[PDB]
């Protein structure tokens, strides 16, 4: 446990320091400097807002992982709610970016109206409202326990059936449905990019479409690569709960260490947008 106690706060601090600066800079440059805010840039501004809102609560994670939780039940609930909101909003904003790309490339002439509407009004109803409504479990179950010698801030379900159900719902809504939408959109997009001689009817529009499309591909690939090993770990853990996989307690302890370390490392997704602006904005 000493290695985890030394390792988790270090990663949390690194991610907090990088994410605060990156997301604050992105939000300033886009919103308050009124610079480039095209459709994909509007979506990425939403992404950075959610990322900053989550990152501003990482010191609580570090303090909980090091020593204890002396903050209170209200703060426990608040940090849980923020975590869930960011977790779902990020992946669904990515799905909306993918859908916008499909509309822009496949239907390159009549998409202006259902490319303005989908980015101006449908985005809120399709991203933020379900994200907020999915935090009801974080309003009901998030509580501070009274474990021996230290307090614990975590969600407390009546039993393990809710744990399995919410793990599966998290897996679905955060990996599969947005993943399926992105697979469909980008499969069609790539089938069109390597077969259509010239998108739209001019060279400049073609190259603009390619240049706008590529960073979204890199961002989606980085996001899914960052989040995948955590999903593998929680899938094995769920199968352990489902009693399909039976091994010794050493196996469960190793899986739990794997999951904790991999979640701490998967929190690196909050730094993808600023890093991508840095690399591609040369």
């Amino acid at each position, epitope marked *: 446990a000493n290695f985890n106690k030394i390792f988790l706060p270090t990663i949390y601090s690194i991610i907090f320091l990088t994410g605060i600066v990156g997301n604050g800079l992105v939000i300033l440059v886009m919103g308050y400097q009124k610079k480039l805010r095209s459709m994909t840039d509007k979506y990425r501004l939403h992404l950075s807002v959610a990322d900053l809102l989550f990152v501003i609560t990482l010191p609580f994670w570090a303090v909980d992982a090091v020593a204890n939780w002396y903050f209170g039940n209200f703060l426990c609930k608040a940090v849980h709610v923020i975590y869930t909101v960011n977790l779902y909003s990020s992946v669904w904003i990515l799905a909306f970016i993918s859908l916008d790309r499909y509309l822009a490339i496949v239907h390159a002439t009549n998409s202006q109206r259902p490319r303005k509407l989908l980015a101006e009004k449908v985005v809120y109803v399709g991203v933020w409202i379900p994200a907020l409504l999915l935090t009801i479990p974080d309003f009901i179950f998030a509580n501070v326990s009274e474990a021996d010698d230290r307090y614990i801030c975590d969600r407390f379900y009546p039993n393990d059936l809710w744990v399995v159900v919410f793990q599966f719902q998290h897996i679905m809504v955060g990996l599969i449905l947005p993943g399926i939408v992105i697979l469909s959109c980008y499969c069609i997009i*790539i089938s069109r*990019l*390597k077969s259509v*001689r*010239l998108l739209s009817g001019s*060279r400049e529009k*073609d*190259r603009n479409l*390619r*240049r706008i*499309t*590529r960073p979204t591909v890199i961002l989606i690939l980085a996001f899914f690569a960052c989040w995948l090993p955590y999903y593998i770990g929680i899938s094995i853990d769920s199968f352990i709960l489902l009693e399909i996989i039976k091994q010794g307690c050493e196996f469960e302890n190793t899986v739990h260490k794997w999951i904790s370390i991999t979640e701490a490392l998967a929190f690196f997704h909050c730094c993808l947008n600023p890093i991508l602006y840095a690399f591609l904005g040369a």
Partner: nanobody
Amino acid sequence: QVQLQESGGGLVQAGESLRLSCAASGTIFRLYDMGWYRQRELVASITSGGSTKYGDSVKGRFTISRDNAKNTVYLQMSSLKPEDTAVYYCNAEYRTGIWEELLDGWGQGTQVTVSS
């Protein structure tokens, strides 16, 4: 960048047969359009799908062919005329990657003279 090599020139007699070969070599991801030109009058252009578009003076005398596997375009010269004695340039539209823009290439130039 890609490289295009032209061959098929020399001394030929009027009304005889020839076969110009234009091979594309280099960093190629996909070839879209390949044609023969002559300012640059289109005498024969074949797309990747085979949609040939012969010129006004090339009707009945010039037949084009394409081998996408070999990345080459073949033009057949038949019923040569004194007006056909000119330098022929091979054109190809390519692309080096999925995210890259459309690019245009040109060949060195092949000179064909009809004996009389």
